[PDB]
Amino acid sequence: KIEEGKLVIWINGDKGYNGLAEVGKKFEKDTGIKVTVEHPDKLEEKFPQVAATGDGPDIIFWAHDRFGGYAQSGLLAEITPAAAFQDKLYPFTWDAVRYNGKLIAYPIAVEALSLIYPPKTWEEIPALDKELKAKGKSALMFNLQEPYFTWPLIAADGGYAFKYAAGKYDIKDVGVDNAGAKAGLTFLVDLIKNKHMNADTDYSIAEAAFNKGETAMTINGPWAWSNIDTSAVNYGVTVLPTFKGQPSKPFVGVLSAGINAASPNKELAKEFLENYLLTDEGLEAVNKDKPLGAVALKSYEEELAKDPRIAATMENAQKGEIMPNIPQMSAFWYAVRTAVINAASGRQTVDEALKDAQTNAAAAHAISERVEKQSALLINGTLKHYQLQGLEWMVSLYNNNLNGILADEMGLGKTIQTIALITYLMEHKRLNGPYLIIVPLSTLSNWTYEFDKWAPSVVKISYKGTPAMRRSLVPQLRSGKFNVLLTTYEYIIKDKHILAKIRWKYMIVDEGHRMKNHHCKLTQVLNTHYVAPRRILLTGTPLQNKLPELWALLNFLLPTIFKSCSTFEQWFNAPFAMTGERVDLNEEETILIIRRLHKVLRPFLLRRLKKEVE
Numbered sequence: 001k002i003e004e005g006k007l008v009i010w011i012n013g014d015k016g017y018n019g020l021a022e023v024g025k026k027f028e029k030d031t032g033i034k035v036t037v038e039h040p041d042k043l044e045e046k047f048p049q050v051a052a053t054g055d056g057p058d059i060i061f062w063a064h065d066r067f068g069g070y071a072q073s074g075l076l077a078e079i080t081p082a083a084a085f086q087d088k089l090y091p092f093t094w095d096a097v098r099y100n101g102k103l104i105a106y107p108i109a110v111e112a113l114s115l116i117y118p119p120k121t122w123e124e125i126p127a128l129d130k131e132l133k134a135k136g137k138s139a140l141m142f143n144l145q146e147p148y149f150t151w152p153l154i155a156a157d158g159g160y161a162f163k164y165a166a167g168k169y170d171i172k173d174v175g176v177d178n179a180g181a182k183a184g185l186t187f188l189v190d191l192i193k194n195k196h197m198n199a200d201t202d203y204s205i206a207e208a209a210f211n212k213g214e215t216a217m218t219i220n221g222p223w224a225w226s227n228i229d230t231s232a233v234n235y236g237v238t239v240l241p242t243f244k245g246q247p248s249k250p251f252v253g254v255l256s257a258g259i260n261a262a263s264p265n266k267e268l269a270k271e272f273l274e275n276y277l278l279t280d281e282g283l284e285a286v287n288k289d290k291p292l293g294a295v296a297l298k299s300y301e302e303e304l305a306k307d308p309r310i311a312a313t314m315e316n317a318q319k320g321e322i323m324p325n326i327p328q329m330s331a332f333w334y335a336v337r338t339a340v341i342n343a344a345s346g347r348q349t350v351d352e353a354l355k356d357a358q359t360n361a362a363a364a365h366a367i368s369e370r371v372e373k374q375s376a377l378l379i380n381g382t383l384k385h386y387q388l389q390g391l392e393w394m395v396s397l398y399n400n401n402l403n404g405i406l407a408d409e410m411g412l413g414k415t416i417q418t419i420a421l422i423t424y425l426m427e428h429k430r431l432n433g434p435y436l437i438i439v440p441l442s443t444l445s446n447w448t449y450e451f452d453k454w455a456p457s458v459v460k461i462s463y464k465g466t467p468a469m470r471r472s473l474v475p476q477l478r479s480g481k482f483n484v485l486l487t488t489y490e491y492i493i494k495d496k497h498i499l500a501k502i503r504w505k506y507m508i509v510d511e512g513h514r515m516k517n518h519h520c521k522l523t524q525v526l527n528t529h530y531v532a533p534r535r536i537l538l539t540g541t542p543l544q545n546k547l548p549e550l551w552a553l554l555n556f557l558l559p560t561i562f563k564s565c566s567t568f569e570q571w572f573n574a575p576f577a578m579t580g581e582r583v584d585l586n587e588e589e590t591i592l593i594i595r596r597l598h599k600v601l602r603p604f605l606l607r608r609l610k611k612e613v614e
């Protein structure tokens, strides 16, 4: 479990773990509290597993970005340092450990990419290579294949990953396509076509070139310094050049110390971190085992700044931007990796490659999660290839906080595909919470039966019967002992005073073949009185070319957005109602509205036909 009156700390093997242990020994010496320092293999991967249990370490040491995921799950505690302690650390480092307006960790170290040799501007480098190539060398050689290294000039003029709003990042405000991003990336390909730089240059080539004295400059980080020290090159470290009178913005990696929320030793971790480790002597002890580069502590940074290399990694960091703590970043990197490659290799123009990457980073199904096999709780049958493909798309809906439509033709096992989602959300996620399933009366008994065949594990209630029979089910609900609740549309409408009181995790409505008039009265109640974030619709029809049906589908998928607006006429006339004119849509206007809604809903519907399956 998680032992009281003691401290267990996890830090990576590539860090000053033995140095940190001495700070722990000094803590035990003065207080009596034992401090255990461990470096487990893939600790960033083991931490979310053990912390969800209520086990693992009291303190975790990792970069602030991975801490964003843990903070969302609620695995890390809201740290409570006084104003006076916060004033000791650089204010920007606290922003790296802020999640939903809460300090979730104590910043330790700081890392950013640096210019290693100087050219004050990027613009002055084409000239410099002319000289160096006459002498038999090259002015610059860095890893181009990876977007982490190429990004600082792209971000310089105006480029950005996600726009940082008041407190949070916007995963829809992506700046891979603006004037700035294009200006920077055009300059990069300019240098490639002028033969100053080669597009085939990777990490191994860029490194071996600077070490063998073949190139005058390179862009890397502190991790390289060790391998260049052993190369006897008279290298220096400075700030990255200014593009268009604006500085280059590299990504800032802040080593942080996070407190586990399952730990009974929270005040002990505050005392050890604030008073033993986040001190000049405390950081110095770690820095002696394995250097920390720049540090968040003003006092110890001013002293380390005597070394120009450390004052450099700190100049770059203050001028750059901190790495976003959100999982959407994986889609942004996979976008800009291929964007930069294609542009430079000539396979796409700058304006083309960036257009795609901007579309791909802002895509709804940003977070990817492979589904190889089905859930263990799903037995007495094996899910077909398209049915597994359907489970992967439905988990992607849950992962990216999207509502969706499974419009597969009747008899494609939508029922089994739904059942398979619930089982995977229990096996691989801790989502056992109440599931609402609204089915047609005709197939109610087939749903209760299919659950019995495929997932006997899943304890379900069947909200059906005479008034007295339903009143009998009331206590089992209040317990929350159940996993699923199956019912017809009439009991959602009639027995709202009992069913609306539950905090439904996921909610599923199966309309069968076609939707009916009573499906809208059902959603009118569902929207007003019921609480369910995630929603899924099971239909047999494809996306209709009728505005009333699309209006309905919209109110089912986005219940919040259509509060004040009752009709599609009021909704789509809104940009034209400034004069108080009341005119309905016409044939043409309506065709274009249908067209746009089909484009808008495209990533929320999954349909397969029988002729393309088998």
Ligand SMILES: O=C(Nc1ccnc(Cl)c1)Nc1ccnc(C#Cc2cccc(C(=O)O)c2)c1
Pocket: 509, 511, 515, 519, 520, 521, 522, 523, 524, 537, 539, 541, 542, 543, 544, 545, 546, 549, 550, 551, 552, 553, 554, 555, 556, 566, 567
């Ligand atoms: O729309 C659907 N299926 C579907 C299937 C294939 N293509 C299309 Cl376009 C649609 N199903 C469907 C299932 C359940 N509840 C609704 C609804 C509604 C609603 C809520 C509030 C106000 C109004 C209103 O009418 O003011 C309507 C729609």
